[PDB]
Design an enzyme around this catalytic site. Sequence first.
Site, mmCIF file in Angstrom:
data_model
loop_
_atom_site.group_PDB
_atom_site.id
_atom_site.type_symbol
_atom_site.label_atom_id
_atom_site.label_comp_id
_atom_site.label_asym_id
_atom_site.label_seq_id
_atom_site.Cartn_x
_atom_site.Cartn_y
_atom_site.Cartn_z
ATOM 1 N N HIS A 1 37.859 55.745 -20.835
ATOM 2 C CA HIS A 1 38.802 55.605 -19.934
ATOM 3 C C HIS A 1 39.826 56.327 -20.014
ATOM 4 O O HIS A 1 40.979 56.384 -19.467
ATOM 5 C CB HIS A 1 38.146 55.315 -18.573
ATOM 6 C CG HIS A 1 38.693 53.380 -18.963
ATOM 7 N ND1 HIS A 1 39.692 53.255 -18.893
ATOM 8 C CD2 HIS A 1 37.947 52.818 -18.059
ATOM 9 C CE1 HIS A 1 39.980 52.021 -19.133
ATOM 10 N NE2 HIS A 1 38.496 51.578 -18.890
ATOM 11 N N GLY B 1 45.740 45.706 -18.899
ATOM 12 C CA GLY B 1 46.507 46.363 -19.655
ATOM 13 C C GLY B 1 45.721 45.745 -21.040
ATOM 14 O O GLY B 1 45.457 45.433 -22.637
ATOM 15 N N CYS C 1 42.611 45.955 -21.376
ATOM 16 C CA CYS C 1 41.311 46.856 -21.492
ATOM 17 C C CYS C 1 41.643 47.514 -22.935
ATOM 18 O O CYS C 1 42.283 47.370 -24.095
ATOM 19 C CB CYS C 1 41.461 48.245 -21.097
ATOM 20 S SG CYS C 1 40.736 48.462 -19.088
#
EC number: 3.4.19.12
Lengths: 298, 297
Positions: B38, B140, B142
């Site tokens: 993503h 942040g 991820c």
Amino acid sequence: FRKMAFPSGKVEGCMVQVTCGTTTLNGLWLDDVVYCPRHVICTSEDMLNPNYEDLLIRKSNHNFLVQAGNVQLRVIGHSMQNCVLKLKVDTANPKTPKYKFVRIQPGQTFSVLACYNGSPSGVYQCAMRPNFTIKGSFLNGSCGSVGFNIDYDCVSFCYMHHMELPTGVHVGTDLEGNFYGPFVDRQTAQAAGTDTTITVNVLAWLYAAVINGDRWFLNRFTTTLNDFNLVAMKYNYEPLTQDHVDILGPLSAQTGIAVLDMCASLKELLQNGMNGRTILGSALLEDEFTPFDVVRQC
Amino acid sequence: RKMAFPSGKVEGCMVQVTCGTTTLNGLWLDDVVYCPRHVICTSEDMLNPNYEDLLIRKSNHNFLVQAGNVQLRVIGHSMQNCVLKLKVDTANPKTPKYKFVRIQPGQTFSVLACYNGSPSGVYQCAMRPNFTIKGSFLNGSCGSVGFNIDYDCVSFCYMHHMELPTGVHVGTDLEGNFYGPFVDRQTAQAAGTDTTITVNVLAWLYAAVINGDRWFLNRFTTTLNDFNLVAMKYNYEPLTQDHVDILGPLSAQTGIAVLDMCASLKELLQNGMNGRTILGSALLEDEFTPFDVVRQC
Ligand SMILES: CNC(=O)[C@H]1C[C@H](n2c(-c3cncc4ccccc34)nc3cccc(C(=O)N[C@@H](C)c4ccc5ccccc5c4)c32)C1
Ligand SMILES: CNC(=O)[C@H]1C[C@H](n2c(-c3cncc4ccccc34)nc3cccc(C(=O)N[C@@H](C)c4ccc5ccccc5c4)c32)C1
């Protein structure tokens, strides 16, 4: 919210094995010095009344076997600083991080890299208790494991593990070899003083609970600082100083809850218990997160 | 203590990945950087993303990868499942021995939480029976990864993708397969009802007896079926014969049979703890596996 340790890699590359006679434990290799507990030179029959100066003068450099992974390090000199032995070696550690030594105060937290035979087994968080002990997880062989923080790429070494007391708590020194608390590296009747709860940390953790969305424990009351302390001490909580109040200021500003109003909530929580509820996954009040830790993680 | 694996072998693999205005973390092993797919998406893309079509519109130069202060040139990209694989022109000299593994609910692992490619902290987590993890992750994070270590080999098992409304966390294995019935799309998603990991509670009771907490032992024993009746009643996972065998060692190390322990847990479930604690907890802890107890003790 989790007990977060610092990433251990910078310390992992400093762990070595030190053997003296039949005794093996962990050492910390920084530049060309290896630091370890001075009781490595003792045979347990020495431990009732050891004379470390007399024991150490009889030792040669080659009596100390230091192994870094698969490679042997050559000891070229040795000296005692307080209760820490410093072994000068032929090779400086190429993995030496940027570091300093810091002596911490009761209530401060740090990460521990538990090691056996110079190899790390695990990392966890804990705190200097008000009685100068730490509630660690340490087995035979873990002496010389170290505790540290790593704010802003600087490793601050604050703890080296020396002993486990009869109550199962742990005691050690700073990296200058000075024991935390009244303890000595000797087989004596020493026992931990009665422990108390680190009040400023419980308050920081309640602020963390508010940041993460819980308000159920707040109330409409306030308190003077002296009335809070008179109550808190009846629960074996440590006195809250104006220094602690100032240190909680940033968390107070972020949440809109005055420090003395959070003290009023803690007073009620000690009186009432939790009524079947939890706070940040815990059914007890948690005292091993500092205000700095909450700001770091949240 | 809740003990994580030493994280040094993983720290040397964390990098920063930027695509457009989106920045998150990547895992750099040999000449491939792994990260959530993503990363290629805008907010509006997530309403119904066609990832094959969104990725075909990106070029190599759309991906900025930085390993510390050193930029890494992307020379290729592909998707595996929900993981994006960015081929880079430099192999990671710090790549450890590693494998990609998929873990089962109830198993534990260490999380190296990471922001802007820089490791911030490490903690121990368990995969819940509802396939979420109770981590702590901010904006942040991820691309942070979970792992176990066995004698020099890093077993990567988790990559962080999302946080659910209840504040728990969901991700994939490193082959990009989600844990749990979750999708990387903007849609109504929620954690299912969760259960307590019975075999882990039993392992932690054994760790308690190894450490001198014995007040909950009793003269009684039970059977697997009787016990699983009460487990059902209290939202505990069923205990299987494999669990009993997996507790085998601790049963001998302590000399306490599994069905003997189950009779203790039964009583703790029915009558509570009566103001007492176990290993410093007022709750029954279920995020230590039998292996975790053996490793630490
Ligand atoms: C009463 N000891 C202590 O609590 C100290 C000594 C214990 N230990 C540990 C160790 C470290 N964490 C926790 C432990 C739990 C159980 C058993 C051992 C440990 N890992 C060790 C590795 C090598 C040597 C020793 C050891 O045993 N050395 C001998 C010569 C000794 C004997 C008595 C001592 C008394 C006082 C001070 C130091 C003493 C030292 C080690 C810790
Ligand atoms: C439903 N979001 C989620 O649970 C995650 C996705 C978010 N996040 C995080 C992040 C990771 N842990 C916890 C967080 C808590 C608060 C805010 C952000 C995070 N760190 C990020 C770093 C870079 C980008 C994002 C992000 O926001 N990306 C955008 C394109 C996005 C939008 C909707 C999405 C829906 C579903 C899945 C992924 C979605 C992704 C990041 C939130």
